[PDB]
């Protein structure tokens, strides 16, 4: 919205919080399954 800081803070801060939740959720999902899969490598070569 022509990056005006009034609505910027006031409502676009909540919009940024919304962006954090799309991103935060994605990151959490990646971390949970990535840990469980990469921590279960077959061998050192399989780990590579």
């Amino acid at each position: 919205g022509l990056d005006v800081s009034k609505e910027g803070t006031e409502a676009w801060e909540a919009a940024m919080k919304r962006y954090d939740e799309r991103i935060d959720r994605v990151e959490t999902r990646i971390t949970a399954r990535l840990r469980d899969q990469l921590g279960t490598a077959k061998n050192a070569n399989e780990m590579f």
């Binding site: 990151e27 959490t28 971390t31 949970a32 840990r35 469980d36 921590g39 279960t40």
Partner: protein
């Protein structure tokens, strides 16, 4: 008679387990016949190992009942016995005789079950000496001894955690200072997340019986010194304590996350019980107590949510009065309420995973098991959202 060679033959290695079988099956065969809805389910107490044991936590048996570790903080009632008391019992046979005795060499404080193991039991002590037991046989010696240096703990392990799966066998041991140490459940040498719960204020967080989110979520809620619901994560961008949603008072003696969903949503809610003489409802969007319950007469110690009906908790107090409430059914009053022997200051409450029965622990020994046969299969999601809306309309003026 003279039987030393028969002590080696008869009382051999594998024959001691057979003798345990003989004693167990004949002592179970003692239930021989002739050879011509408040109901108070059961109660158990050892008059030699549970006697006057001033304890604060044990190791209940939600899954696989009728065998639950009574990891007692061994009092000086029996100084001529191994200092440490852990007692699995036999609710299936309903006995209190000292058959499944278990002991250590220190004050056994909350020796929970190990990860992926019913026989292996993990447990911290007063000096943070986490010991372990692999009872594949019928043994009782603590086979593990944790190092106790500067990075380790020397304070009571409040509530140790088991995080992950067969890949990640993590253990979170915490002292009174709040030092978290994620010992691997295989080697007792290096704790992975061996850090400090750094928070906005008072980084040396005086934790007090924290609680573990359902669904392997790391967004824990640490119970602390004055309520102080420390909401955070162990790792990520907020490895330390992110914030402290509070409004509860005193050292938290009972806090529990969401129960087992009957027919409701996930219901990202929890509750707290402490020295404020009450329990206070909470969720993930409050920062204040969602619903402070009745500040009963005395220190409300433990509280626990039921799995059958997810929207109902149970709480005892400083005057031993268990009050199980389902505000979606019984709002101003508890669903069921019954006292304990006399009016003492208990410390634990734990719902049976089967539901409609509960094993409540006293802080001086004996464990009571009450029975409440009321709930059936019902869609309580409707009543859940409706009561949340009623609270959302009551708080306004």
């Amino acid at each position: 008679l003279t039987e030393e060679e028969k002590q080696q033959i008869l009382h051999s290695e594998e024959f001691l387990s057979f003798f345990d079988h003989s004693t167990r099956i004949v002592e179970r065969a003692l239930s021989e016949q002739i050879n011509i809805k408040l109901s108070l389910n059961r109660q158990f107490f050892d008059e030699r190992w549970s006697k006057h044991r001033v304890v604060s936590c044990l190791d209940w048996s939600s899954q696989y009942p009728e065998l639950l570790v009574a990891s007692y903080n061994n009092n000086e009632d029996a100084p001529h016995e191994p200092d440490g008391v852990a007692l699995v019992w036999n609710m299936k046979y309903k006995k209190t005789t000292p058959e499944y005795v278990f002991h250590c060499q220190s004050a056994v404080m909350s020796a929970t079950f190990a990860k992926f193991h019913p026989n292996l039991v993990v447990g911290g002590t007063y000096s943070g000496q986490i010991v372990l037991w692999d009872n594949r046989s019928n043994k009782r010696t603590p086979v593990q001894r944790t190092p106790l240096s500067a990075a380790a703990h020397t304070h009571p392990v409040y509530c140790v955690n088991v995080v992950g799966t067969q890949n990640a066998h993590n253990l979170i041991s915490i002292s009174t200072d709040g030092k978290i140490c994620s010992w691997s459940l295989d080697m007792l040498s290096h704790p992975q997340d061996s850090m400090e719960l750094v928070h906005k204020q008072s980084k040396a967080v005086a934790v007090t019986s924290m609680s573990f989110p359902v669904g392997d979520v790391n967004n824990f809620v640490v119970g602390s010194e004055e309520g102080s619901v420390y909401t955070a994560c162990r790792h990520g961008s907020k490895a330390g304590i992110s914030e402290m949603f509070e409004g509860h008072q005193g050292p938290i003696t009972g806090i529990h996350c969401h129960a087992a969903v009957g027919a409701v949503d996930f219901s990202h809610l929890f509750v707290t019980s402490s020295f404020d003489w009450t329990v206070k409802l909470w969720s993930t969007k409050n920062n204040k107590p969602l619903y402070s319950f009745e500040d009963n007469a005395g220190y409300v110690y433990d509280v626990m949510w039921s799995p059958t009906h997810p929207a109902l908790f149970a709480c005892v107090d400083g005057m031993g009065r268990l009050d199980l409430w389902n505000l979606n059914n019984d709002t101003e009053v508890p669903t069921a309420s019954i006292s304990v022997e006399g009016n003492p200051a208990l410390n634990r409450v734990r719902w049976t995973h089967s539901g409609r029965e509960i094993a409540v622990g006293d802080s001086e020994g004996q464990i009571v098991i009450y029975d409440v046969g009321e709930q059936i299969a019902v869609p309580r999601n409707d009543e859940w959202a409706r009561f949340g809306r009623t609270l959302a309309e009551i708080n306004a003026n």
